[PDB]
Amino acid sequence: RSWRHLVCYLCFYGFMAQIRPGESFITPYLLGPDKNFTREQVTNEITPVLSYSYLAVLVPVFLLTDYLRYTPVLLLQGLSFVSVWLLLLLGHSVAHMQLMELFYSVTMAARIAYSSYIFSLVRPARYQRVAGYSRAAVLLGVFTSSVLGQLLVTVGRVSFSTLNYISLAFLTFSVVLALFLKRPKRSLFLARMLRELGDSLRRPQLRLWSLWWVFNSAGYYLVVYYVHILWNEVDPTTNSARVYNGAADAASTLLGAITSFAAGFVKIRWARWSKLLIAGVTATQAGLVFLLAHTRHPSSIWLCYAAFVLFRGSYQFLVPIATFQIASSLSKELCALVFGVNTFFATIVKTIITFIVSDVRGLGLPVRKQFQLYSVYFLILSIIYFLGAMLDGLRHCQ
């Protein structure tokens, strides 16, 4: 009876807090006529700050989340979103945008906490059902936010400044609603952990997916960041309505949802073949990145959108299999630590790559050549996986 109230309120909060209309149109706004911003300044100055601050912030945020009650950090996430949008709206120079990226990194870091909070509050026996409902709610919110913003701009023909003004109200309501949710009673954080980690580490199947999560995730995140600037490069946004950035986001979200559903269907049945599966998916990802790099025609933008959504769906499909394969050996207590270390290593790799290719006082290449290099990086990853699979197969015959 009383349980239903919280059960629905949590889903409502998640869905409402996923409603950001202007998130997907941030990049075109930075390059819009109203702001005297050059493209190379955006690619070389603004974005690397995001990567640096993500690595700087991540571990303290997670440690604070676990030590403190989840509600304070969950509220801080919404407050940081509010600060990000305020800075973006009133940004007047490049340093302001750098600070904005720093503030957005904090919001990015807090993503993981909410899944832990739901596990914390809900009774253990009923956890699965509420967790599935919450995941459905948050995914639906993410899918609907971009659709709402893109449809508002496309047929409404509203200006960019108006769109972010509309977004700010939703963010304010999100934080105000976020304030109320009840704090979990007791979820605070030991040779047992070390012994369990040592025992599990010896498992063969885990290492492969761990390495994949380390490298391929960093590559995918770099591509996800820079894609928008590449899109702006391909075609000038002379008219606000013409741009279709949000629609690509919504289609990618839907394709990711459908493909993620598929993974569960045959997650166990494809366990035997994993290196070959990784190679097959990585090859296509590399090919899509190369196609994104090589497309320069003004009228080929439509094909470019399909390339990016296909690449995002291809990456999304692989995630559930990795999560299931990693999770099984360990326990809930150690799952969060196993995942945490992985993300920290991945962010370190991404920081090194981004500081080399794109940061000033370095190679500092423009977006085009940067994507051309990322294509080679993904191709190398795919070749490594194929060689490993062939080496494994060779013994199998004997």
Query: Where residue 86 sits, what CATH number does that domain have?
Result: 1.20.1250.20
Q: Is 221 annotated as a binding residue?
A: yes
Which residue, 189, 221, 250, sits at the end of a domain? 189
Residues 244, 361, single domain; the answer is yes
- Containing structural domain, residue 243: 190-398
Same-domain status, 54 and 201: no
220 in a labelled binding site:
yes
320 is in an annotated binding site: yes
Q: What is the CATH number of the domain that holds 348?
A: 1.20.1250
Q: What is d(CA 128, CA 118) in angstroms, rounded to the nearest whole number?
A: 10
Distance of CA 181 to the CA centre of its chain: 25
Residue 101 assigned to a binding site: yes
Determination approach: cryo-EM
Q: Is the same domain home to 161 and 177?
A: yes
Both 258 and 330 in one domain: the answer is yes
Number of domains, the chain: 2
- 40 is an annotated ligand-binding site residue: no
Q: Is 13 labelled a binding residue?
A: no
312 is in an annotated binding site: yes
Rounded Cα distance, 280 and 198, in Å? 31
Residue 165 shares a structural domain with residue 227: no
Does 242 lie in the same domain as 116? no
CA atoms within 13 A on the CB side of 208: 21
Say whether both 79 and 225 belong to one domain: no
Residues 119 and 265 in one domain: no
For residue 373, which amino acid is it? L
Q: Is position 260 annotated in a ligand binding site?
A: yes
| Packed helices 204-234 and 47-67: angle between N→C axes, nearest 10 degrees | 140
Asked if 246 contacts 24 with a C-beta cutoff of 8 angstroms, the reply is: yes
Structure tokens at 231: 């899109």
Residue 38 annotated as binding site: no
- Chosen domain end from 154, 189, 224: 189
User: What distances in angstroms separate CA 109 from CA 103, 179, 321, 345, one per listed residue?
Assistant: 10, 19, 23, 14
Q: Is 46 annotated as a binding residue?
A: no
Q: Which helix (H) or strand (E) holds 313?
A: helix 301-329
Q: What is the dihedral of CA 201, 114, 125, 67, to 10 degrees?
A: 70
Q: Is 157 annotated as a binding residue?
A: no
Q: Are residues 197 and 85 in the same domain?
A: no
Contact 28, 230 (CB under 8 A): no
Angle at 144 between CA 143 and CA 145, to 5 degrees: 100
- From 179, 174, 180, 177, select the one nearest 82 (Cα to Cα): 174
- 226 carries a ligand binding annotation: no
Report resolution in angstroms: 3.6
Query: Annotation-wise, does 335 bind a ligand?
Result: yes
Same domain as 248, residue 137: no
- Is 54 part of any known ligand binding site? no
Q: Which of 308, 295, 306, 289 is nearest to 374 (CA)?
A: 289
Q: Which of 134, 161, 189 is the last residue of a domain?
A: 189
DSSP 8-state assignment for residue 299: G
Q: What is the DSSP letter of 22?
A: S
Is residue 207 marked as binding? Answer: no
Domain co-membership, 203 together with 55: no
Residue 364 · residue 358 · CB < 8 Å: yes
185 in a labelled binding site: no
354 and 388, same domain (yes or no):
yes
How far is residue 1 CA from its own chain's centroid? Answer: 36
